[PDB]
Structures are given as C-alpha cells and as structure tokens.
Amino acid sequence: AAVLFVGSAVHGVATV
C-alpha cells in the first residue's frame, strides 16, 4: 500500500 500525505490547513498520513 502507498503511504500518502493527504489533506488540504490540515493534513495527515494515510495508507492505500
């Protein structure tokens, strides 16, 4: 799964 940095501010890490 890809480790991702998501959001737009508030961001966080997600895995897909």
Name the site residues for Cl ion (rule: CB under 5 A).
8-9
CB of 14 to Cl ion, least distance (A): 13
CB of 16 to a second copy, least distance (A): 6
End-to-end CA distance of the chain: 5
Contacts of 9 (CB under 8 A, 6+ apart): none
Binding mask 1-16 for a second copy (x = CB under 8 A): xxxxxxxxxxxxxxxx
Inter-residue contact 4 to 12 (CB < 8 Å): no
Binding residues for a second copy, rule: CB under 8 A, are 1-16
